[PDB]
Design a protein around this ligand. Structure first.
Ligand SMILES: *CCC(=O)Nc1cccc(C)c1Nc1ncc2cc(-c3c(Cl)c(OC)cc(OC)c3Cl)ccc2n1
Length: 288
């Protein structure tokens, strides 16, 4: 069973399914008449569906993610829900499709060779960071705690709009496995805050810690956090107050905000609202 939510319901026959994107499995599609102002117009979207092997639990995960997306609402800096297909077939959840892929691969693809300068100068990297903070400010105001904020979960559109992905999984029924390898072989637990790692508690300020790590990923052009360090010793270092060094090409304002994001005590970290305003002021400092 699945109830008709008429206003989110999109007829599945107006989708032309295309290339698999990844893995719950995801396909690119063309959708006709997403915006009812031009009802025959094609747009490109991403469609999520269950795999053949799926259990009750997998269905509940996809459904719960869809329902949290409905509740959270739309914002320019997040992957927005566009539609769902729940009648007369398998469940499809339809979302915005970001043509340049994830921010980690985007950054890594644009690292310059040797000392030669690259396209992604300080103001560009700061603007990126600002966009991510605006998305997170939005999520924060909607009482959403991400639990896996990282460059791999930020997608880049054709117009270089940064969009937060996978923000429905925590309030959803899905259990995040922080020891499940990224496509890169890295471990998500390297973005988790010490209160979650040691005290087993998550707060709104836990995502701020993760944002600090994401800042570091940005200014290293898609580098691996705590490079060289196996998680076991990483965790003992984090006991003694170890923090990542300022990366080689980074404005001091941004390292300053990283250090603030990485206060041991969650209650001492800034909010995304404060972070948005701070990055707005850095951009102006730097670009004028
Ligand atoms: C848009 C055309 C394209 O080829 N895009 C593409 C190629 C290679 C890698 C990536 C990451 C993409 N873009 C892309 N854009 C948006 C995506 C959105 C999701 C997604 C889904 Cl399907 C759901 O389903 C409920 C929920 C999400 O988070 C709230 C997200 Cl982020 C998956 C993959 C996407 N890929």
């Amino acid at each position: 069973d699945l109830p008709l939510d008429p206003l989110w319901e999109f007829p599945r026959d107006r989708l032309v399914l295309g290339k698999p994107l990844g893995e719950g499995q995801v396909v690119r599609a063309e959708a006709f008449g997403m915006d009812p102002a031009r009802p025959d117009q094609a747009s490109t979207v991403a469609v999520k569906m269950l795999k053949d092997n799926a259990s009750d639990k997998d269905l509940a995960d996809l459904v719960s993610e869809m329902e949290v997306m409905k509740l959270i609402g739309r914002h320019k800096n997040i992957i927005n829900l566009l539609g769902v297909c729940t009648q007369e077939g398998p469940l499809y959840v339809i979302v915005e499709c970001a043509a340049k892929g994830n921010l980690r691969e985007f950054l890594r693809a644009r690292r310059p060779p040797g000392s030669s300068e690259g396209p992604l100068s300080f103001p560009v990297l700061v603007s990126c960071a600002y966009q991510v903070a605006r998305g997170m400010q939005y999520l924060e105001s909607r009482k959403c705690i991400h639990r896996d904020l990282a460059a791999r979960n930020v997608l880049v559109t054709e117009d270089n709009v940064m969009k937060i992905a996978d923000f429905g999984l925590a309030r959803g029924v899905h259990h995040i496995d922080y020891y499940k390898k990224t496509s890169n072989g890295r471990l998500p637990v390297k973005w988790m805050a010490p209160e979650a790692l040691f005290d087993r508690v998550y707060t709104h300020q836990s995502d701020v810690w993760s944002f600090g790590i994401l800042l570091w990923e940005i200014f290293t052009l898609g580098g691996s956090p705590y490079p060289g360090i196996p998680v076991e010793e990483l965790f003992s270092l984090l006991r003694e107050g170890h923090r990542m060094d300022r990366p080689p090409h980074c404005p001091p304002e941004l390292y300053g905000l990283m250090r603030e994001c990485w206060h041991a005590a969650p209650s001492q970290r800034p909010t995304f609202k404060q972070l948005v305003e701070a990055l707005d002021k850095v951009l102006l400092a730097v670009s004028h």
